[PDB]
Design an enzyme around this catalytic site. Structure first.
Site, PDB file in Angstrom:
ATOM      1  N   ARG A   1      37.313  47.389  52.997  1.00  0.00           N
ATOM      2  CA  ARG A   1      36.669  46.283  52.312  1.00  0.00           C
ATOM      3  C   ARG A   1      36.577  44.995  53.126  1.00  0.00           C
ATOM      4  O   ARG A   1      35.917  44.050  52.704  1.00  0.00           O
ATOM      5  CB  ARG A   1      37.365  46.021  50.990  1.00  0.00           C
ATOM      6  CG  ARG A   1      36.883  46.938  49.921  1.00  0.00           C
ATOM      7  CD  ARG A   1      35.503  46.589  49.374  1.00  0.00           C
ATOM      8  NE  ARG A   1      35.174  47.425  48.226  1.00  0.00           N
ATOM      9  CZ  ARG A   1      35.597  47.201  46.986  1.00  0.00           C
ATOM     10  NH1 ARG A   1      36.353  46.144  46.725  1.00  0.00           N
ATOM     11  NH2 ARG A   1      35.279  48.039  46.008  1.00  0.00           N
TER      12      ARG A   1
ATOM     13  N   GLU B   1      40.284  41.938  49.207  1.00  0.00           N
ATOM     14  CA  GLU B   1      40.717  42.191  50.575  1.00  0.00           C
ATOM     15  C   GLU B   1      40.058  41.215  51.501  1.00  0.00           C
ATOM     16  O   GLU B   1      40.700  40.700  52.421  1.00  0.00           O
ATOM     17  CB  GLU B   1      40.352  43.614  50.993  1.00  0.00           C
ATOM     18  CG  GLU B   1      41.314  44.696  50.495  1.00  0.00           C
ATOM     19  CD  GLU B   1      41.183  45.060  49.009  1.00  0.00           C
ATOM     20  OE1 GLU B   1      40.302  44.539  48.290  1.00  0.00           O
ATOM     21  OE2 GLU B   1      41.988  45.894  48.541  1.00  0.00           O
TER      22      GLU B   1
ATOM     23  N   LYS C   1      49.105  46.874  28.341  1.00  0.00           N
ATOM     24  CA  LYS C   1      49.300  47.931  29.333  1.00  0.00           C
ATOM     25  C   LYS C   1      50.492  48.733  28.842  1.00  0.00           C
ATOM     26  O   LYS C   1      51.568  48.165  28.572  1.00  0.00           O
ATOM     27  CB  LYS C   1      49.520  47.365  30.751  1.00  0.00           C
ATOM     28  CG  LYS C   1      49.509  48.408  31.878  1.00  0.00           C
ATOM     29  CD  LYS C   1      48.528  48.017  32.996  1.00  0.00           C
ATOM     30  CE  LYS C   1      48.840  48.653  34.343  1.00  0.00           C
ATOM     31  NZ  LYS C   1      49.781  47.803  35.162  1.00  0.00           N
TER      32      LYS C   1
HETATM   33  C1  LIG Z   1      39.768  47.605  46.909  1.00  0.00           C
HETATM   34  C2  LIG Z   1      40.990  48.062  46.110  1.00  0.00           C
HETATM   35  N1  LIG Z   1      42.169  47.481  46.330  1.00  0.00           N
HETATM   36  C3  LIG Z   1      43.237  47.854  45.652  1.00  0.00           C
HETATM   37  C4  LIG Z   1      43.177  48.851  44.688  1.00  0.00           C
HETATM   38  C5  LIG Z   1      44.506  49.185  44.004  1.00  0.00           C
HETATM   39  N2  LIG Z   1      44.469  49.211  42.532  1.00  0.00           N
HETATM   40  C6  LIG Z   1      44.241  50.370  41.866  1.00  0.00           C
HETATM   41  S1  LIG Z   1      44.289  49.970  40.147  1.00  0.00           S
HETATM   42  C7  LIG Z   1      44.648  48.323  40.398  1.00  0.00           C
HETATM   43  C8  LIG Z   1      44.863  47.355  39.258  1.00  0.00           C
HETATM   44  C9  LIG Z   1      43.666  47.330  38.356  1.00  0.00           C
HETATM   45  O1  LIG Z   1      43.784  46.169  37.580  1.00  0.00           O
HETATM   46  P1  LIG Z   1      42.999  46.171  36.256  1.00  0.00           P
HETATM   47  O2  LIG Z   1      41.540  46.321  36.427  1.00  0.00           O
HETATM   48  O3  LIG Z   1      43.458  44.823  35.441  1.00  0.00           O
HETATM   49  O4  LIG Z   1      43.485  47.550  35.516  1.00  0.00           O
HETATM   50  P2  LIG Z   1      44.703  47.788  34.478  1.00  0.00           P
HETATM   51  O5  LIG Z   1      46.043  48.197  35.343  1.00  0.00           O
HETATM   52  O6  LIG Z   1      44.988  46.384  33.679  1.00  0.00           O
HETATM   53  O7  LIG Z   1      44.369  48.865  33.543  1.00  0.00           O
HETATM   54  C10 LIG Z   1      44.700  48.103  41.769  1.00  0.00           C
HETATM   55  C11 LIG Z   1      45.006  46.708  42.302  1.00  0.00           C
HETATM   56  C12 LIG Z   1      41.938  49.454  44.482  1.00  0.00           C
HETATM   57  N3  LIG Z   1      41.770  50.431  43.591  1.00  0.00           N
HETATM   58  N4  LIG Z   1      40.883  49.039  45.199  1.00  0.00           N
END
Ligand SMILES: Cc1ncc(C[n+]2csc(CCOP(=O)(O)OP(=O)(O)O)c2C)c(N)n1
Ligand SMILES: Cc1ncc(C[n+]2csc(CCOP(=O)(O)OP(=O)(O)O)c2C)c(N)n1
Ligand SMILES: [Mg+2]
Ligand SMILES: [Mg+2]
Lengths: 579, 578
Positions: B352, B324, B240
């Site tokens: 959700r 969630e 990242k």
């Molecule tokens: C239902 C829901 N809850 C929370 C989020 C908040 N959110 C946006 S990106 C993210 C992290 C994504 O993790 P990952 O798929 O490992 O992406 P990376 O940061 O490693 O690129 C979160 C928790 C969301 N988009 N949807």
């Protein structure tokens, strides 16, 4: 006396007086009783029969209520009730004023969670496990989860959190290879060399072991139970175990229809029913529309999709107990030019609220929802009354909502919904309706509703189940007009402006909660039209409804014929008292 | 002239131009893209680190497949900046998330290259399965490939999807983008775990783990994987923030970084006192004297303002990942056991868990408290993130109570009530700030009582939380206009509503929520059943998703802001200065 052992057990303390080698006999006694309970009528024979031995082993080993035994869905838990002070009340299980068909916290100290929707046992078990630790206590936490329930996102995500936390926890996987209409899914994790299908969750894995050997089951539990961290005891059982009719036909015997235990012969319903009508219609539609694709979340039988699954195997899909997956998988197909129809009960659609809002409604995708068990469903009680529909779908931009008066109107809404942009929802109750000819496909202006009975002065607006009550109420009342308000998103605004402008009063009736439903849509409409008639809003009160027949729930909630007539009388209409 | 430092991008207007490059030139494009995203993001609130992280696979993907014919799907979409630069939108990265500009996430009506519209996590696999099934049904052979990060995989909706995907057995490539970050550090079991296949039990091929920044070697793999029968999980490991030293060193902050200069890595320290913080402070303080409090978050520790709390009370904090549904029903389980759990969740993601709130928490009227951040229009994230439905979908649930605190003292009041009375309670509040407040502020309030805040019957405005700011301003030099902090949507203040609708010429309701089934709708139902028929104007967000803009903008054009209320006030015959 046919049940010598059971006669002396009023709870798990009485149970712990029997030797292990007495338990198989108790196990037979429990099967006998469960069969007699159910021969009555519509209840869960097969799932509960299959679960007797594990429930016995658990209650033998752990001491509820200090220890907590949690049941997923709770339909497979009749022996549990029988072994916890409820043996006599089984006579009235699911009957009004009787005990619930599932475990209920209100009902007994021994009922750990109020369940009915699947896949909630593990998140709840974790909650208890965590609470326990914070408190500095220690007491066992066992969850009984079936293979079907394991398919749900909720179960699968939970394990992953469970494994991370690594707490003391017993999870018994009750594996039948049966859901209702028999399990699906790259079997969830069971069906895999032989080692640990769950290793990637960091959970200890035991089995598979024989789930009908109560003695071997005690032995195991005793040893598994003080082990550190979470454990899956994987047991293999036969749905409907100890009744050869149930064993051989696990789908019918999930909810049998009044039978004779001696023969295996049952009362055959020749009813029709909305389920069958939707059945016939899609089976007919997809014959001329290659883009139609039906998806159910684990409910082929319940939704009338048996013939559909046989007549178009290449356009049918069972996603398991995974409503989230049903809705957004339909979203995918629609994005690629298909015309997916999601077939789903109202309470289960609740599980896919966000999926409807974010994955379907934002880009106005072509997904038709056929929503069964809309409104009160009766005996299943609070966990199943499909009473929120018209509120939660209503709030979602661009999601259309209609209630067909009959099969012809169902078909019309179907034809329309399949033939125009955006999501369309169509809700219909558990109940019957008349068969219409093959090839019945009316055109209807979506959003337009129809006058059914003349009369200004007082006008009733209702659809679906409510419309029966409305039409029954007005039978001999010349003043009182009735409108089949068969669409809820679009309201018929040209019609409501005109009716609300020149009527002394209006009644709206809905087989839905009163809060933010049809009643509210009308009020909001009238307000934007700056119109002010007297409006009486009848529906289900803002409070859950215990198990009871739909007809009493409606009677007590004030939406059945007599109640509408009482409201009409409060309004000034001359209502006879009658001979 | 061509005075740029990006010779390759300068010639790429889409995937067809990119396949002109030899595979040996790919590392060079890889780096141009990197620079390109850092320049794009130094503006402000964009998704820097995740996008840098996925630069190499997005390049390899567009090099091997070809959208639009083939279908590349992105989970969440916050990582797809390279995808937008490689698909004819390089020039409008300048305005991404801005009103009138391209969207921050992948969006279907924005480009034929955007396979799905996303914002919520975990929805990629399931759409991919859908596309695969339709394609098969239609008798076609195009590739369907999904990109899912490792936090996203935490979601029940991806986990179940794999279950159905492994069952159907159709051509499909799923790339697991595993950098062991969510927004926070990713939470485990599956993260803890990663010559054996972790997805064995779901009948999906597994390749990796493989280096996810070797563009040369990712093309090689994809070329061989993409024509195989059945589904494939390609597991890649990325960093990242790759490409940017200080983003690598701190991938939590650089996930959505403030205005910064690329050369140092120094950023504008945002020293505002947000609601999130006012929450965090309040729960930290409260949990100190109450051992039964337990805060659960679904992957949003930082956003929900819970960093300090997670450090001060490690034993009463729980991060269940992007799930969630689990956050809420774990809380049910807790409350069932005499604990007093607090679910910290953004409105939009609470969606959700509607069924969990209803069936697991509402049926037995359980002691779960929901502190709902991002209530209302969130702005730049657009339609998939605006939390404008929550006053509607909660209201329908029997027993779920709903407050909107005028400010931080009132937040504490509501938090106090919920935590010391039975049944569920939901407290919702915006993106923005309120004044800090002294430690130990814990007012006692009567749940369901509104406060009058300005005198004058005639036209009375009913507003809560953010609408209340607008209401108050609107009313300034208008002595006929009274304002009520309608700080409670459920229950409503029955008595005060009957009093005001009985006496005022007209009423206005205002709400940072959809207009359908919300506070207005609730007001209209109350008046109805009290048989009171006053003029009511219902102001809110229209029954129409809101594309990305600034809250101020969306509120302007929806007509809930001050000048807009002032206009309404004039229409009802109030004397309003021009
Ligand atoms: C239902 C829901 N809850 C929370 C989020 C908040 N959110 C946006 S990106 C993210 C992290 C994504 O993790 P990952 O798929 O490992 O992406 P990376 O940061 O490693 O690129 C979160 C928790 C969301 N988009 N949807
Ligand atoms: C959320 C949800 N969707 C659908 C159902 C419908 N349903 C009731 S019982 C059942 C089968 C459960 O399968 P399993 O866990 O194997 O139970 P078993 O037959 O083994 O006793 C289903 C699908 C439900 N209860 N909950
Ligand atoms: Mg089973
Ligand atoms: Mg990641």
């Amino acid at each position: 006396s046919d049940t010598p052992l059971l006669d002396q057990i009023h709870g798990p303390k009485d149970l712990k007086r029997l030797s292990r080698e007495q338990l198989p006999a108790l196990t037979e006694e429990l099967r006998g009783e469960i069969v007699r309970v159910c021969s009555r009528g519509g209840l869960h024979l097969a799932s509960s029969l299959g679960a007797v031995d594990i429930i016995t082993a658990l209650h033998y080993v752990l001491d509820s209520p200090r220890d907590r035994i949690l049941f997923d869905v709770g339909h497979q838990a009749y022996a549990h009730k029988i072994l916890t002070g409820r043996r006599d009340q089984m006579a009235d299980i699911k009957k009004e004023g009787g005990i619930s068909g599932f475990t209920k916290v209100s009902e007994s100290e021994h009922d750990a969670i109020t369940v009915g929707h699947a896949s909630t046992s593990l998140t709840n078990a974790l909650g208890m496990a965590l609470a326990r630790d914070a408190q500095g206590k220690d007491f066992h936490v066992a969850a009984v989860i079936g293979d079907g329930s394991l398919t749900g996102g909720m179960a699968l995500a939970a394990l992953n959190t469970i494994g991370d936390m690594g707490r003391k926890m017993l999870i018994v996987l009750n594996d039948n290879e049966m859901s209702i209409s028999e399990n699906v899914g790259a079997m969830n994790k069971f069906m895999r060399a032989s080692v640990n299908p769950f290793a990637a969750m960091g959970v200890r894995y035991v089995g598979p072991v024989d789930g009908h050997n109560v003695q071997e089951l005690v032995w195991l539990l005793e040893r598994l139970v003080d082990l550190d961290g979470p454990t899956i005891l994987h047991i293999v059982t036969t749905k409907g175990k100890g009744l050869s009719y149930a064993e051989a036909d696990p789908i019918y015997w999930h909810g049998p229809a009044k039978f004779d235990p001696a023969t295996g012969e049952y009362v055959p319903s020749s009813a029709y029913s909305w389920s069958a009508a939707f059945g016939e219609a899609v089976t007919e539609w997809a014959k001329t529309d290659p883009r139609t694709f039906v998806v159910t979340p684990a409910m082929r039988e319940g939704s009338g999709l048996v013939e559909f699954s046989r007549v178009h195997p290449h356009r049918y899909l069972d996603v398991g107990i995974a409503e989230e997956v049903a809705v957004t998988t339909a979203a995918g197909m629609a994005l690629q030019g298909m015309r997916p129809v999601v077939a789903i009960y109202s309470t289960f659609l609740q599980r896919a609220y966000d999926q409807v809002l974010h994955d379907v409604a934002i880009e106005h995708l072509n997904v038709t929802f056929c929503i069964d068990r809309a409104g009160i469903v009766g005996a299943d009680g609070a966990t199943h009354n499909g009473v929120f529909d018209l509120s939660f779908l209503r709030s979602i931009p661009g999601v259309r909502i209609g209630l067909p008066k009959d099969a012809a109107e169902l078909r019309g809404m179907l034809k329309y919904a399949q033939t125009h942009d955006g999501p369309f929802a169509i809700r219909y109750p558990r109940g019957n309706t008349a068969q219409v000819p093959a090839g019945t496909w009316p055109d209807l202006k979506w959003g337009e509703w129809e006058r059914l009975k003349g009369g200004d002065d007082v006008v009733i607006l209702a659809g679906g189940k409510a419309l029966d009550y409305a039409l029954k109420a007005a039978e001999d009342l010349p003043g009182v007009g009735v409108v089949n308000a068969r669409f809820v998103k679009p309201l018929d605004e040209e019609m409501l402006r005109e009716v609300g402008g020149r009527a002394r009063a209006l009644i709206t009736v809905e087989d839905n909660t009163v809060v933010g439903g049809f009643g509210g849509a009308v009020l909001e409409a009238l307000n934007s039209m700056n119109l002010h008639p007297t409006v009486r809003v009848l529906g289900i009160p803002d409070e859950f409804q215990e198990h009871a027949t739909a007809e009493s729930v409606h009677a007590r909630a004030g939406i059945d014929a007599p109640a509408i007539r009482t409201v009409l009388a409060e309004l000034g209409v001359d209502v006879p008292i009658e001979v």
